[PDB]
Amino acid sequence: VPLDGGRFATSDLNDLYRRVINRNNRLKRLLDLAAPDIIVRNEKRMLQEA
Amino acid sequence: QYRYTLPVKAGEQRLLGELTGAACATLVAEIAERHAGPVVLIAPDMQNALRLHDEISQFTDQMVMNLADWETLPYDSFSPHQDIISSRLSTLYQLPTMQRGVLIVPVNTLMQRVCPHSFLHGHALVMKKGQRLSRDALRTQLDSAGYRHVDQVMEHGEYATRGALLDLFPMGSELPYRLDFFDDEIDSLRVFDVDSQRTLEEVEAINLLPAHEFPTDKAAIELFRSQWRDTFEVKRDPEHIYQQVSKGTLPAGIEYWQPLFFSEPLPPLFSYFPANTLLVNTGDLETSAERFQADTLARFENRGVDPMRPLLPPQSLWLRVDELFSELKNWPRVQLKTEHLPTKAANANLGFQKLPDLAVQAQQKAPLDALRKFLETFDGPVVFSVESEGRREALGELLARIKIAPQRIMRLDEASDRGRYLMIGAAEHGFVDTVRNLALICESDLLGERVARRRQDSRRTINPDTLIRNLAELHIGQPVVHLEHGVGRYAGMTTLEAGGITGEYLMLTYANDAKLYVPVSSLHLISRYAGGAEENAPLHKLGGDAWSRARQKAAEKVRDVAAELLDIYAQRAAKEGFAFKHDREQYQLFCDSFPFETTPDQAQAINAVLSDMCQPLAMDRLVCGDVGFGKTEVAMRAAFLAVDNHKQVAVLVPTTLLAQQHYDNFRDRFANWPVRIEMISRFRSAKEQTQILAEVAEGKIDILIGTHKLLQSDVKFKDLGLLIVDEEHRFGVRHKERIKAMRANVDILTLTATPIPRTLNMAMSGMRDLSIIATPPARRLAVKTFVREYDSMVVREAILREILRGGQVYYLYNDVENIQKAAERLAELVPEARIAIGHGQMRERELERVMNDFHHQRFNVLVCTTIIETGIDIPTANTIIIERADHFGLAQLHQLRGRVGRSHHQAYAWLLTPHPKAMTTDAQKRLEAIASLEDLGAGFALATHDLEIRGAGELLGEEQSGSMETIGFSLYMELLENAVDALKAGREPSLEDLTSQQTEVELRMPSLLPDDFIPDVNTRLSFYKRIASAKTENELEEIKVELIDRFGLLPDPARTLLDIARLRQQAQKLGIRKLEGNEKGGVIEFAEKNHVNPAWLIGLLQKQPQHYRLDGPTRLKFIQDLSERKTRIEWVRQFMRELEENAI
Ligand SMILES: Nc1ncnc2c1ncn2[C@@H]1O[C@H](COP(=O)(O)OP(=O)(O)O)[C@@H](O)[C@H]1O
Ligand SMILES: [Mg+2]
């Protein structure tokens, strides 16, 4: 919803879902790249945290 | 015949004096060459010892080695990187019996106690051809020794066992061996390389030394626990090293628990000396050993706390200096003193006096004045002793200036009665030997003194009728000029404080009553007003608008890029790529010419590059990965593949130094392959670059490495086929696109270490192919880092850690004004250092002077700004200390963290930060980002974490790494495919290609279609195409009215674009190849078969030379203060409209 000043309300669920989608897309690309284990390990850790 | 007598007795001395630098080397050289018995030279400090390890080789062919010190302080907290140990104890095996040769030991490792011969002799063994020794029996023997079983043996202490075939790397030797055990017996002793993996040759017998300097097995661990529970106490903790070795694992600082593992007092290694052994001393041991013991005791009492890891008493692990100077009296000693000892027996003062100052300077007309005078008046032999053979050329032409060509002799004894001789080594200070009248004139004897001076006393003509003679009788209020600030009103005497002192000063009230005081001592900075207007003088403001003038802003997108990069990518996607051919054995030959073997990660990257490079698609590939991982050989193989098709590879690197490195690397690799390669940058003269460009245009050059001199609209490749950008960061956007604009289907290949977030994101979205690389080829030991609040003692201990190891320190201050102060501040903190400065604003000759001093270890600590980001990496530099890790790019931090190492020496990288509340939040995030992900292969992870910190910049524009809310990926792909369709449809030429048809109409003004006026970019690009393609004015205003119809009235940039094209039309008609107008004027350049009237140009020049000046037949520099671009347009339009009548 907008705050009448050209912006929109935060709607925290959108922020959490945005974090999850960002992290999941990053992990998907890193799996498509056959990336080394430490970086994909860190990304899976941060996905789980998200 | 000799000059002195060798001493052989219990504790007698032989005192040799009058010696000066780089003569101790030749004395001990003749000592080695004249004496039967090993010579152990005991240097006053390891630093000096390292220097001596060079010079002795220069003067003798006799065998030399050092005893490797653990590179940590007493009671430090680091394992010595067991590689070092592999050298160390190896000498301890041969030290029992070595008849000749020299061993150089500093006092530090001289006084350390060492493991007894019981352990080393017992746990050593021999393997011969004919032992009936079983396979797993020998494996268990290796286990009891304490080696490590890995299948990929590369470094020391490593073994593999696979069925019948066994291999191991003994800690004493230098090469591994393969065994091939059959019927439970040795059958082969085959040396196979760490890189070839194939048997070089077959020996019959070889020796094996144990794991490291103390035993490790379970009986020894039980002995260790027994002796700990005897002396110290125990506390249950998984970090307490008692229980931590009860778990079996050896801690970091365990080597300082030497005597506990051994059940007997440790020998002081003098037993390790042979019976008939002579010692030579340099400097004064009585001071250096005592200072080291005092440092050890101070560091012990500092660390003799923290009962979690308590410590030993030094009176067992280290010798005491009284014990040292008693135990010395069982070995004869020769003391080399740099001082005139008066007289006694066993004491001879050898005349080895100083050379006179042969200083070379170009300020005098004759540079080699002192040299040419000294050598001719000299009566004996002179030797020059150049460091490197290339530097020998630096000899040859300089001695050609007085026409001197010397002889090349190996040994110093090859000097004759009189002459000029040269040789190779590392000595640094020549001398004159009075006994044989020898002269040695080293490299640094002609380049002696470093100079630092800029300018002084410009307008100091203190006798002008306006200086007022500093009479101090001036009435208050009379205006006064101060040379640094300006004109104001004097306002009398005043009394102030400046931090606890009183002072009297001169009040000067400048404009807006900003008071200024200067002391009465510096009255010579004051003059009376010289304009004669003491009742009419103006009033300046102090210092001027330093930051107030910075409120300007704007300069509206001088030229938009969102309608250019889309065009470039459209040209890329529309045309297909080029087809390459790879031939298996042909390219395999180039694989064989590489004298190494690739990692699996390198194999993956090479497979990807070769596969996508052979295909008819356009490569766009990152080879991201940490520094020192072998990325260059990838692009090197790719360049070979391209040049096999003769397709003119172009490497592009962001500095002349990297350009030089890639130039000589590619030339040395392709020395056997028939190909031409060169570098191009500012170091190439214009007289040479004009040749290089023509050679490239005809296509005689297959590889052109160079810096941004490429993207200067002047190179014209006959057929470009492969761009190789190296170090992608520090190339902004449009630097990587000025080259792509020339040929649409170039196979990009972009190496880096840490990509900028825009290119990392646009790799992460499938637009750019990516190929991460890890697993460095050699075992490559990582660089420990630390994050500390800045502390004057942690910096001091780090600096002495690196100095007493024997290596340089990169102090990174990142400032030019205060670095001069920081030099003496660091010198006061660390007296034991040899500190000097180097920064980018030096005169660029002193800078390379300091660098070439730094390669030769003439001074340890280099306080320096981020010029070392490029790096000229040496072997000894092995500790970088960032003074302010608060504000730095994360990519920069990683890159400087990679600048150290490149050796077997374990490096360090401190990152000193300010108070944790003082640093910004982004500074915090950068600091845990660099602190946490510390391992091998952290190059990619750091850039991945840099993304989402700064955010990927706008995809279709310039300005990488920005958090802007611009167009998304979905819209960008839509725009690209729409551009592909509209391009492939009707015959529509490229934008930049018709820039070939364009004339240079630069005016330094906003001339474009603004994005507010036209939101969509593809219609904007279509209007660019239709504007620039149109050839008549009626077509131009047709487009103008069509803009009126679709989007209404024109902004000023749009109408300037239209009348610029209007100018372009009859500019091409008149042959005007180039014209530039600006605020103050400009220059107009026409063709040669042009219509410029000679009579009319003569009329203009002779009627207005101040506003028209031909410099050449066609280059007309006009000087006209066109303040408004409106006036600019009117002047140029009316000028060329008057020209078209004179057009004949
Ligand atoms: N198989 C190998 N064996 C030994 N050294 C290697 C091997 N591969 C690469 N190297 C070394 O690694 C370095 C390669 O670094 P390079 O790719 O030139 O730049 P960067 O340091 O950015 O990776 C070279 O100095 C080379 O000697
Ligand atoms: Mg490189």
XYZ file of N, CA and C in Angstrom, chain B residues 210-374:
495
model
N 63.638 -38.293 9.902
C 62.283 -38.359 10.467
C 61.434 -37.132 10.215
N 60.271 -37.109 10.872
C 59.234 -36.126 10.577
C 59.736 -34.704 10.776
N 60.055 -34.345 12.011
C 60.503 -33.002 12.360
C 61.203 -33.070 13.709
N 61.629 -31.911 14.212
C 62.772 -31.847 15.122
C 62.560 -32.492 16.489
N 61.415 -33.128 16.707
C 61.170 -33.886 17.921
C 60.322 -35.088 17.550
N 60.407 -36.186 18.300
C 59.557 -37.345 18.001
C 58.088 -37.025 18.224
N 57.241 -37.910 17.716
C 55.810 -37.660 17.714
C 55.017 -38.850 18.237
N 55.603 -40.046 18.267
C 54.870 -41.272 18.558
C 54.373 -41.303 20.007
N 53.605 -42.353 20.316
C 52.796 -42.370 21.530
C 53.655 -42.474 22.784
N 54.779 -43.192 22.703
C 55.718 -43.214 23.819
C 56.237 -41.816 24.114
N 56.561 -41.062 23.063
C 57.014 -39.690 23.249
C 55.907 -38.816 23.820
N 54.658 -39.055 23.417
C 53.557 -38.266 23.963
C 53.370 -38.569 25.445
N 53.538 -39.834 25.830
C 53.459 -40.186 27.244
C 54.594 -39.547 28.034
N 55.791 -39.512 27.447
C 56.910 -38.817 28.072
C 56.620 -37.328 28.223
N 55.993 -36.730 27.209
C 55.635 -35.318 27.264
C 54.656 -35.040 28.392
N 53.637 -35.888 28.530
C 52.675 -35.698 29.609
C 53.333 -35.876 30.968
N 54.245 -36.843 31.083
C 54.950 -37.048 32.343
C 55.759 -35.819 32.727
N 56.484 -35.246 31.770
C 57.326 -34.105 32.109
C 56.511 -32.836 32.325
N 55.374 -32.695 31.639
C 54.486 -31.577 31.934
C 53.944 -31.684 33.352
N 53.423 -32.856 33.723
C 52.900 -33.018 35.075
C 54.001 -32.947 36.125
N 55.261 -33.129 35.725
C 56.370 -32.804 36.612
C 56.503 -31.297 36.798
N 56.737 -30.566 35.709
C 57.086 -29.151 35.833
C 55.861 -28.252 35.993
N 55.016 -28.185 34.971
C 53.867 -27.293 34.970
C 52.670 -27.987 35.616
N 51.493 -27.389 35.464
C 50.240 -27.980 35.904
C 49.339 -28.199 34.697
N 48.233 -28.905 34.919
C 47.287 -29.205 33.853
C 45.929 -28.617 34.205
N 45.185 -28.229 33.170
C 43.820 -27.737 33.311
C 42.998 -28.257 32.144
N 41.840 -28.841 32.444
C 41.003 -29.443 31.413
C 40.398 -28.377 30.512
N 40.876 -28.298 29.276
C 40.389 -27.329 28.305
C 40.783 -27.811 26.914
N 39.860 -27.797 25.947
C 40.203 -28.229 24.583
C 41.143 -27.295 23.832
N 41.664 -26.239 24.453
C 42.609 -25.373 23.764
C 43.931 -25.414 24.522
N 43.874 -25.803 25.797
C 45.071 -26.072 26.587
C 45.899 -27.148 25.908
N 47.170 -26.842 25.635
C 47.928 -27.697 24.733
C 48.274 -29.037 25.360
N 48.206 -29.156 26.688
C 48.398 -30.456 27.322
C 47.351 -31.454 26.847
N 46.077 -31.157 27.098
C 45.021 -32.021 26.586
C 44.914 -31.950 25.070
N 45.436 -30.891 24.450
C 45.286 -30.780 23.006
C 46.286 -31.687 22.290
N 47.421 -31.981 22.928
C 48.291 -33.023 22.398
C 47.908 -34.376 22.970
N 47.158 -34.401 24.074
C 46.571 -35.663 24.503
C 45.513 -36.134 23.516
N 44.904 -35.208 22.775
C 44.110 -35.591 21.614
C 44.970 -35.968 20.413
N 46.280 -35.745 20.474
C 47.170 -36.202 19.426
C 47.669 -35.118 18.495
N 46.926 -34.024 18.381
C 47.286 -32.981 17.434
C 48.297 -32.018 18.051
N 49.300 -31.650 17.251
C 50.353 -30.735 17.667
C 49.888 -29.304 17.468
N 50.004 -28.436 18.471
C 49.486 -27.068 18.343
C 50.325 -26.188 17.435
N 49.986 -24.900 17.397
C 50.709 -23.964 16.545
C 52.108 -23.694 17.084
N 52.200 -23.205 18.316
C 53.484 -22.835 18.876
C 54.155 -23.938 19.666
N 54.182 -25.153 19.115
C 54.644 -26.299 19.888
C 56.159 -26.418 19.848
N 56.805 -25.798 18.859
C 58.248 -25.949 18.709
C 59.003 -25.294 19.852
N 58.340 -24.432 20.614
C 58.955 -23.900 21.815
C 58.763 -24.808 23.013
N 58.051 -25.916 22.857
C 58.105 -27.010 23.824
C 59.074 -28.082 23.350
N 60.298 -27.647 23.091
C 61.324 -28.599 22.671
C 61.777 -29.505 23.811
N 62.277 -28.999 24.952
C 62.955 -29.906 25.893
C 62.040 -30.908 26.562
N 60.733 -30.651 26.592
C 59.807 -31.599 27.198
C 59.749 -32.916 26.442
N 59.907 -32.887 25.126
C 59.788 -34.077 24.303
C 61.020 -34.958 24.334
N 62.021 -34.641 25.148
C 63.320 -35.243 24.906
C 64.004 -35.879 26.105
N 63.505 -35.691 27.323
C 63.943 -36.396 28.529
C 65.401 -36.136 28.906
N 66.108 -35.289 28.168
C 67.482 -34.931 28.476
C 67.678 -33.472 28.108
N 68.662 -32.797 28.706
C 68.976 -31.433 28.273
C 69.388 -31.409 26.812
N 69.019 -30.358 26.154
C 69.278 -30.342 24.728
C 70.663 -29.788 24.457
N 71.412 -30.387 23.539
C 72.762 -29.910 23.246
C 72.741 -28.523 22.633
N 73.800 -27.747 22.831
C 73.841 -26.377 22.307
C 74.359 -26.285 20.881
N 74.306 -27.403 20.158
C 74.723 -27.658 18.774
C 76.223 -27.535 18.560
N 77.003 -27.199 19.585
C 78.448 -27.175 19.400
C 78.988 -28.585 19.233
N 78.316 -29.570 19.836
C 78.602 -30.966 19.535
C 78.389 -31.267 18.062
N 77.457 -30.563 17.425
C 77.242 -30.698 15.994
C 78.394 -30.152 15.162
N 79.302 -29.376 15.752
C 80.435 -28.928 14.959
C 81.501 -30.019 14.903
N 82.214 -30.140 13.788
C 83.355 -31.057 13.741
C 84.475 -30.570 14.643
N 85.402 -31.482 14.943
C 86.454 -31.185 15.913
C 87.387 -30.089 15.412
N 87.796 -30.163 14.153
C 88.685 -29.170 13.555
C 87.839 -28.167 12.770
N 87.212 -27.251 13.498
C 86.307 -26.275 12.917
C 86.696 -24.882 13.383
N 86.631 -23.930 12.459
C 87.016 -22.561 12.748
C 85.803 -21.655 12.618
N 85.699 -20.695 13.529
C 84.631 -19.710 13.523
C 85.192 -18.353 13.136
N 84.437 -17.615 12.334
C 84.753 -16.227 12.034
C 83.582 -15.366 12.476
N 83.908 -14.241 13.091
C 82.954 -13.364 13.739
C 82.905 -12.042 12.988
N 81.712 -11.464 12.930
C 81.483 -10.190 12.274
C 80.741 -9.283 13.239
N 81.157 -8.024 13.306
C 80.567 -7.104 14.256
C 80.979 -7.423 15.676
N 80.024 -7.406 16.602
C 80.328 -7.697 17.997
C 79.228 -8.573 18.573
N 79.588 -9.811 18.901
C 78.618 -10.774 19.400
C 78.128 -10.391 20.787
N 79.013 -9.811 21.596
C 78.774 -9.519 23.004
C 77.592 -8.582 23.198
N 77.258 -7.819 22.164
C 76.098 -6.948 22.181
C 74.872 -7.592 21.556
N 75.021 -8.245 20.402
C 73.849 -8.757 19.700
C 73.243 -9.956 20.415
N 74.082 -10.874 20.899
C 73.577 -12.005 21.665
C 72.903 -11.538 22.945
N 73.511 -10.565 23.625
C 72.929 -10.051 24.858
C 71.599 -9.360 24.593
N 71.512 -8.596 23.502
C 70.252 -7.957 23.148
C 69.188 -8.993 22.828
N 69.571 -10.069 22.139
C 68.600 -11.113 21.838
C 68.120 -11.803 23.105
N 69.021 -12.053 24.057
C 68.585 -12.686 25.299
C 67.689 -11.757 26.103
N 67.995 -10.461 26.111
C 67.128 -9.514 26.803
C 65.755 -9.445 26.148
N 65.711 -9.485 24.816
C 64.434 -9.508 24.113
C 63.665 -10.782 24.429
N 64.367 -11.913 24.486
C 63.721 -13.178 24.812
C 63.140 -13.147 26.215
N 63.894 -12.607 27.172
C 63.408 -12.549 28.545
C 62.239 -11.585 28.681
N 62.293 -10.446 27.987
C 61.186 -9.499 28.034
C 59.930 -10.094 27.413
N 60.078 -10.765 26.271
C 58.932 -11.397 25.638
C 58.415 -12.561 26.470
N 59.304 -13.246 27.187
C 58.882 -14.337 28.051
C 58.059 -13.818 29.219
N 58.574 -12.815 29.935
C 57.824 -12.279 31.068
C 56.552 -11.579 30.612
N 56.527 -11.077 29.376
C 55.270 -10.612 28.809
C 54.310 -11.768 28.575
N 54.815 -12.909 28.115
C 53.971 -14.051 27.808
C 54.024 -15.158 28.850
N 54.762 -14.983 29.948
C 54.835 -15.992 31.001
C 53.628 -15.986 31.912
N 52.506 -15.604 31.321
C 51.195 -15.474 31.922
C 50.301 -16.181 30.924
N 48.978 -16.068 31.094
C 47.999 -16.818 30.313
C 48.270 -18.292 30.570
N 47.869 -18.808 31.743
C 48.174 -20.200 32.110
C 47.612 -21.209 31.127
N 46.612 -20.797 30.364
C 46.265 -21.512 29.150
C 47.419 -21.331 28.170
N 48.191 -22.408 27.925
C 49.524 -22.394 27.307
C 50.528 -21.580 28.118
N 51.028 -22.099 29.250
C 52.099 -21.403 29.982
C 53.409 -21.501 29.224
N 54.550 -21.075 29.758
C 55.772 -21.226 28.977
C 56.932 -21.725 29.824
N 57.966 -22.161 29.118
C 59.187 -22.698 29.696
C 60.050 -21.577 30.256
N 61.089 -21.911 31.015
C 62.139 -20.941 31.275
C 63.157 -20.957 30.153
N 63.595 -19.788 29.689
C 64.563 -19.747 28.583
C 65.907 -20.358 28.904
N 66.236 -20.573 30.172
C 67.542 -21.101 30.548
C 67.711 -22.567 30.168
N 66.673 -23.176 29.602
C 66.755 -24.514 29.036
C 66.607 -24.536 27.526
N 65.655 -23.788 26.976
C 65.467 -23.794 25.532
C 66.518 -22.961 24.804
N 66.962 -21.852 25.386
C 67.983 -21.005 24.792
C 69.227 -21.021 25.659
N 70.375 -20.796 25.036
C 71.594 -20.642 25.802
C 71.577 -19.316 26.549
N 72.410 -19.229 27.575
C 72.687 -17.970 28.243
C 74.010 -17.449 27.709
N 74.131 -16.123 27.585
C 75.265 -15.551 26.858
C 76.589 -15.863 27.541
N 76.588 -15.988 28.869
C 77.810 -16.405 29.545
C 78.185 -17.832 29.163
N 77.190 -18.716 29.081
C 77.443 -20.077 28.624
C 77.925 -20.086 27.181
N 77.372 -19.199 26.353
C 77.790 -19.105 24.962
C 79.242 -18.677 24.857
N 79.621 -17.647 25.605
C 80.975 -17.128 25.513
C 81.973 -17.957 26.298
N 81.506 -18.938 27.067
C 82.425 -19.946 27.574
C 82.586 -21.087 26.575
N 81.476 -21.558 25.999
C 81.533 -22.668 25.056
C 82.185 -22.277 23.741
N 82.243 -20.983 23.431
C 83.008 -20.526 22.281
C 84.490 -20.822 22.415
N 85.005 -20.939 23.638
C 86.434 -21.068 23.881
C 86.949 -22.477 23.625
N 86.154 -23.318 22.972
C 86.631 -24.595 22.463
C 86.738 -24.576 20.946
N 86.594 -23.398 20.333
C 86.707 -23.244 18.897
C 87.560 -22.013 18.608
N 88.585 -22.138 17.770
C 89.391 -20.965 17.398
C 88.551 -19.943 16.647
N 88.858 -18.661 16.852
C 88.000 -17.600 16.336
C 88.801 -16.524 15.621
N 88.270 -16.060 14.496
C 88.828 -14.937 13.753
C 87.792 -13.828 13.711
N 88.098 -12.697 14.335
C 87.162 -11.582 14.412
C 87.494 -10.563 13.337
N 86.524 -10.297 12.467
C 86.648 -9.293 11.422
C 86.048 -8.000 11.952
N 86.883 -6.985 12.132
C 86.448 -5.719 12.698
C 86.553 -4.611 11.663
N 85.524 -3.775 11.606
C 85.543 -2.580 10.768
C 86.136 -1.399 11.525
N 87.311 -1.615 12.109
C 87.938 -0.612 12.950
C 89.428 -0.908 12.997
N 90.220 0.152 13.129
C 91.677 0.056 13.138
C 92.138 -0.428 14.508
N 92.481 -1.717 14.607
C 93.035 -2.257 15.847
C 94.521 -1.941 15.921
N 95.021 -1.440 17.061
C 96.376 -0.863 17.081
C 97.524 -1.819 16.770
N 97.814 -2.769 17.669
C 98.906 -3.726 17.494
C 98.922 -4.792 18.584
N 99.142 -6.045 18.173
C 99.557 -7.181 18.998
C 99.724 -8.388 18.088
N 100.311 -9.466 18.599
C 100.334 -10.706 17.842
C 98.919 -11.263 17.720
N 98.750 -12.192 16.772
C 97.442 -12.747 16.398
C 96.469 -11.644 15.989
N 97.006 -10.582 15.398
C 96.231 -9.393 15.082
C 96.919 -8.692 13.924
N 96.269 -8.692 12.767
C 96.829 -8.045 11.595
C 95.764 -7.158 10.976
N 96.129 -5.904 10.735
C 95.230 -4.924 10.141
C 95.503 -4.889 8.647
N 94.544 -5.367 7.866
C 94.706 -5.481 6.427
C 94.153 -4.232 5.759
N 94.991 -3.565 4.966
C 94.563 -2.358 4.290
C 93.507 -2.638 3.244
N 92.266 -2.302 3.577
C 91.105 -2.566 2.738
C 90.252 -1.305 2.698
N 90.900 -0.195 2.380
C 90.361 1.115 2.693
C 89.260 1.526 1.721
N 88.637 2.654 2.040
C 87.501 3.162 1.289
C 87.936 3.670 -0.083
N 87.080 3.450 -1.077
C 87.256 4.089 -2.369
C 86.851 5.564 -2.310
N 87.524 6.426 -3.072
C 87.118 7.835 -3.137
C 85.782 7.968 -3.848
N 85.099 9.080 -3.588
C 83.716 9.214 -4.033
C 83.600 9.351 -5.548
N 83.381 8.228 -6.227
C 83.086 8.211 -7.655
C 81.587 8.403 -7.844
N 81.114 9.631 -7.662
C 79.703 9.943 -7.835
C 79.469 10.410 -9.261
N 78.407 9.901 -9.874
C 78.065 10.231 -11.251
C 76.814 11.095 -11.247
N 76.894 12.249 -11.903
C 75.770 13.166 -11.977
C 75.772 13.850 -13.337
N 74.577 14.049 -13.888
C 74.420 14.692 -15.185
C 74.308 16.206 -15.087
N 74.339 16.766 -13.876
C 74.312 18.217 -13.719
C 75.567 18.844 -14.310
N 76.726 18.273 -13.995
C 77.936 18.593 -14.734
C 77.827 18.029 -16.146
N 78.510 18.683 -17.090
C 78.464 18.242 -18.481
C 79.063 16.852 -18.643
N 80.155 16.568 -17.935
C 80.754 15.242 -17.958
C 80.209 14.435 -16.788
N 79.437 13.371 -17.027
C 78.905 12.577 -15.910
C 79.979 11.793 -15.173
N 80.795 11.048 -15.917
C 81.779 10.162 -15.309
C 83.090 10.887 -15.040
N 83.022 12.059 -14.407
C 84.224 12.860 -14.199
C 85.138 12.214 -13.169
N 84.592 11.920 -11.987
C 85.384 11.305 -10.931
C 85.870 9.924 -11.342
N 85.031 9.170 -12.056
C 85.424 7.840 -12.511
C 86.577 7.916 -13.502
N 86.457 8.791 -14.505
C 87.496 8.883 -15.522
C 88.787 9.449 -14.946
N 88.694 10.291 -13.914
C 89.909 10.774 -13.272
C 90.537 9.692 -12.404
N 89.710 8.943 -11.672
C 90.225 7.980 -10.707
C 90.855 6.784 -11.402
